[PDB]
Amino acid sequence: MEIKRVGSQASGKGPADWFTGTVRIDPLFQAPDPALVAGASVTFEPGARTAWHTHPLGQTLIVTAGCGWAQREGGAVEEIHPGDVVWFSPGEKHWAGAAPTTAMTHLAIQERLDGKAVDWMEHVTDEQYRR
Amino acid sequence: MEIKRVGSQASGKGPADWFTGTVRIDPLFQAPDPALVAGASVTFEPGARTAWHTHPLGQTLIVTAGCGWAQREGGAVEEIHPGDVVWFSPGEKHWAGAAPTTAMTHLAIQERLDGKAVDWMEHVTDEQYRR
Amino acid sequence: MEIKRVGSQASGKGPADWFTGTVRIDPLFQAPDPALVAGASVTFEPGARTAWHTHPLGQTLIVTAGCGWAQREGGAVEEIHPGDVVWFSPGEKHWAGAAPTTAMTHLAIQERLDGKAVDWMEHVTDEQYRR
Amino acid sequence: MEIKRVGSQASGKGPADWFTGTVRIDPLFQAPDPALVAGASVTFEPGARTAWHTHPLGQTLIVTAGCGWAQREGGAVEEIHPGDVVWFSPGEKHWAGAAPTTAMTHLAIQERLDGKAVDWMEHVTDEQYRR
Amino acid sequence: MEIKRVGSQASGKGPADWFTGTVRIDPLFQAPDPALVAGASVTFEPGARTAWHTHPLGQTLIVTAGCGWAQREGGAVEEIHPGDVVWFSPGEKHWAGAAPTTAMTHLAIQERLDGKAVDWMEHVTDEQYRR
Amino acid sequence: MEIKRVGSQASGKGPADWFTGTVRIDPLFQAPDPALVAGASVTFEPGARTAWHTHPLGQTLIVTAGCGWAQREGGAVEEIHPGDVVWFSPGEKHWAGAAPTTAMTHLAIQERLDGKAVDWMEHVTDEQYRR
Amino acid sequence: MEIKRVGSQASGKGPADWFTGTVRIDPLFQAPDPALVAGASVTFEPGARTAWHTHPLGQTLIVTAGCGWAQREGGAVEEIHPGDVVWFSPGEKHWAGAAPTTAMTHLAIQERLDGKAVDWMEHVTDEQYRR
Amino acid sequence: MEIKRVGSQASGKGPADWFTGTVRIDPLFQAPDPALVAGASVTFEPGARTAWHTHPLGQTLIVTAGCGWAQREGGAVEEIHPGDVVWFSPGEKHWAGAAPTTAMTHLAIQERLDGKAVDWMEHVTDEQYRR
Numbered sequence A, B, C, D, E, F, G, H: 001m002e003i004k005r006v007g008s009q010a011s012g013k014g015p016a017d018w019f020t021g022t023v024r025i026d027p028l029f030q031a032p033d034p035a036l037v038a039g040a041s042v043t044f045e046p047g048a049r050t051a052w053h054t055h056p057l058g059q060t061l062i063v064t065a066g067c068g069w070a071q072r073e074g075g076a077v078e079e080i081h082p083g084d085v086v087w088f089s090p091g092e093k094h095w096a097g098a099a100p101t102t103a104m105t106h107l108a109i110q111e112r113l114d115g116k117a118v119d120w121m122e123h124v125t126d127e128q129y130r131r
């Protein structure tokens, strides 16, 4: 039994290649082999969002604070709220982030395929970031 | 993209074979194949706890409310608080639950092996439910 | 400065005169004089709700988990979700609780008038517990 | 019954006169007369903290995410965690904020005295911001 | 006297333009000219509902199983239970469907005008469905 | 006297091991000891049916809606209609379900032996699902 | 034969340097030379505990009421219950006290060396008290 | 058979309306109907005592620790010790508490009439709290 106490994992800033705007990543877990799952808490400041991206074994988001936006390619921009659970399919191109006026925090849970949790693609333009 | 809106997943009661005392299970997600991960929010009333059990690809707990206790076989009873992240290895025999006078909720995340996410064993006696 | 550490305040059961169904009350704070504000976390099991009641200086609810229902006298039954903030006026007769199949937790904040924070009235019938 | 739905109140940035570092204020409620209580959710980025200040009728903090620091004048710098409840007395000079490496969010609840919730004083120096 | 024996009319799936979620339509009758009335049994899975729509000569619902929700545009969401009779006025924009966690079946009876019994409008958003 | 009100028992999905196709289970009652009887409403979509199975103390089916099929091992496939009552003897291997083009709902009443109410066997093949 | 009748020895409050929280000391005996043993009854309110300390010839605790916690530096926190006997070795750094929500009383028996029965050390932090 | 284990019943504080000074109440049992009896352990700090009060079906006190005082209206103040058993008749006005320099714990056993176990009256004044 390994316990990582609250406060023991340092926060980090969202890399510019992965996010538009100011994002904070709070690591939560990375399961050891042979388990595949990993998780992090991601807080988007107002107006911030991921680039477009895919996950090789899909991704589950559990919104935990605030009010955010998310979209898959070809779909509508949806508003997501604390307690909502979002599922993105393997290889489904999508983004998520804060709404323009409110921050959002979600717990992002995904299984790694050969250690790889994500494939990063182009940023979400100001023209795409609207609803 | 699938959104399971808050309040769209009914609460359920913890089966007597899986728990001592009163427990509520709030499902969150069961990822479709080829993904294997599932998650649920589990609320333990004071004094309530799981039976001893194992998970075939381990388990991650993220405490979200209250103050609980947990223990692996042969180890000390540890207190777990909101924001704490607990990892149980594959095959590691353990229990978790509320502290004696305070409820606890955690998010339990585990990957399934051949559809199975848990192996239930004997209950945690009052003598074992003690630091 | 006083810190009441998590797990240091015992859970309690909701009295039968104050609630229909099973409810747990987790005290959070009762400010000392000259301050008048108090707060508690209240968890309603599915189908559980307060009796009809009023607060002498009003009440604020901040939903923190699950999906619940609330109603003021003469009004419609409204659903309240995590992150929602509800205000009941002084003397406004109301109830709140879980939805029929999902639990709900809220933080209830109210100022006391002459030490009193609530006036309890009749229970919410099954007929009234309906949108 | 007034409901402010999650996402309906825009976030704001912590004024420089009130905070060192980057802080976000999410308003929650301001009770109408004759009630005095007000509340906001305050998220401190790593290293950020309030200036020294007092509240005329005291203040209650409920930590809801992350891991922060707080101190009253003449006291030790304490680490506070989600679920902890902090009470500052009327007129007690104090500060609160993130820890150096982790963000913290708290719900700050205070009663206003003649509409006034706080008296702002000098900033917390880098020499005082240590533990 | 014409009798259509139970089982002799095939079920159909609810078109995507007419419903959110999974719905089954079981035709019952369409009276020949000069009569104008038609009827169908409609079964909504949990969370499923009609698009917003109107009927040119109004509509009567008789709930026959489960527990559902219905709303006129501009009014409150109300629960409808087996044996309840619902009337929508001519041209009244409304929706009906299941509750979030329980299915509902109703018998829908409407008269046609110029050979048309319904005017389909925009879908009912997740926000509209709950509020 | 215990009343489970309409809408208070959430609908569930039929497990793939117990059913071919899409089935919804609406629980009605499970008598506490020393009573042994339990009942549920089961709705089969067109073409859906149970696996072959037995019940240790027999089973009564009361058809409540639609039109379905049922068969015991070595017998013919029979069509059943609302108001028909079907009895399967203890240990009698059988299946029931919808017809290919119409849904069917039945009330299934069975007594438990050693807490078990059913013994699940092989699925009903497409070749077997014919009249 | 010297008898000190119950009630004849006044209670005292536990000094701030020796305890965190509210503690009452009820002296029982201090044997005259050449005997070395002394004893006292100590009642800890919920959450109260000794500072870290050592005893030069060890110490025996006999729990007489309530439910408490104790820890040797470097070991696990263990619960001690009425009738339990605890032994701390000479020079063993430890603390004892109440559990977080229940008081505890123990009888503390220790022998003096050079007229001293205890060596007081630093206080037990909130982090140490729980972990 | 129900066992409430040591440490499972949280300690409470004596309300100011029921006691002068600092008192702790440790609940032991409240028999369910048709039984009427309830019991609690009450610990009075030095100088603390109940208000004057009565019990509708009388009260038995079993002193379990320390040395205290007790008096019925019109009687003398008596000293009571561990193992002493005190009976107050129905409707007899009395008080009990610690002595001025020693704490006292008693087990208070009383039967409820109309769910009420006590009728609280005026506080015991400093002039009355003397022997």
Ligand SMILES: C[N+](C)(C)CCCC(=O)O
Pocket: A025, A039, A040, A042, A050, A059, A096, A108, A117, A118
């Ligand atoms: C890669 N990670 C988890 C740190 C951030 C991506 C989260 C998301 O997909 O929204």
Ligand SMILES: C[N+](C)(C)CCCC(=O)O
Pocket: B025, B039, B040, B042, B050, B059, B096, B108, B117, B118
């Ligand atoms: C399997 N699940 C999530 C339903 C219950 C397991 C709870 C736990 O492992 O602590």
Ligand SMILES: C[N+](C)(C)CCCC(=O)O
Pocket: C025, C039, C040, C042, C050, C059, C096, C108, C117, C118
């Ligand atoms: C008074 N309190 C907080 C213990 C219960 C009130 C719950 C509510 O008003 O919804």
Ligand SMILES: C[N+](C)(C)CCCC(=O)O
Pocket: D025, D039, D040, D042, D050, D059, D096, D108, D117, D118
């Ligand atoms: C004034 N307010 C509530 C917006 C921020 C101060 C919060 C605090 O005292 O830590």
Ligand SMILES: C[N+](C)(C)CCCC(=O)O
Pocket: E025, E040, E042, E050, E059, E096, E108, E110, E117, E118
């Ligand atoms: C279009 N129709 C009549 C077959 C189904 C619409 C049912 C309803 O209005 O609730």
Ligand SMILES: C[N+](C)(C)CCCC(=O)O
Pocket: F025, F039, F040, F042, F050, F059, F096, F108, F117, F118
């Ligand atoms: C086992 N139960 C009641 C959940 C479903 C069985 C339905 C049937 O036997 O036809």
Ligand SMILES: C[N+](C)(C)CCCC(=O)O
Pocket: G025, G040, G042, G050, G059, G096, G108, G110, G117, G118
């Ligand atoms: C110092 N003394 C003996 C009066 C009290 C210390 C009790 C303890 O070591 O737990």
Ligand SMILES: C[N+](C)(C)CCCC(=O)O
Pocket: H025, H039, H040, H042, H050, H059, H096, H108, H117, H118
């Ligand atoms: C009412 N109760 C049992 C909580 C305290 C009364 C103590 C006493 O009567 O002396």
Ligand SMILES: [Br-]
Pocket: B005, B008, E047, E100, E126, E129
């Ligand atoms: Br929904």
Ligand SMILES: [Br-]
Pocket: C005, C008, G047, G100, G126, G129
């Ligand atoms: Br504590």
Ligand SMILES: [Br-]
Pocket: A079, E125, E126, E127, E128
């Ligand atoms: Br929406």
Ligand SMILES: [Br-]
Pocket: F079
């Ligand atoms: Br036939």
Ligand SMILES: [Br-]
Pocket: D079, G125, G126, G127, G128
């Ligand atoms: Br600490």
Ligand SMILES: [Br-]
Pocket: H079
């Ligand atoms: Br005497």
Ligand SMILES: [Mn+2]
Pocket: A053, A055, A059, A088, A094, A095, A096
């Ligand atoms: Mn993603």
Ligand SMILES: [Mn+2]
Pocket: B053, B055, B059, B088, B094, B096
């Ligand atoms: Mn587990």
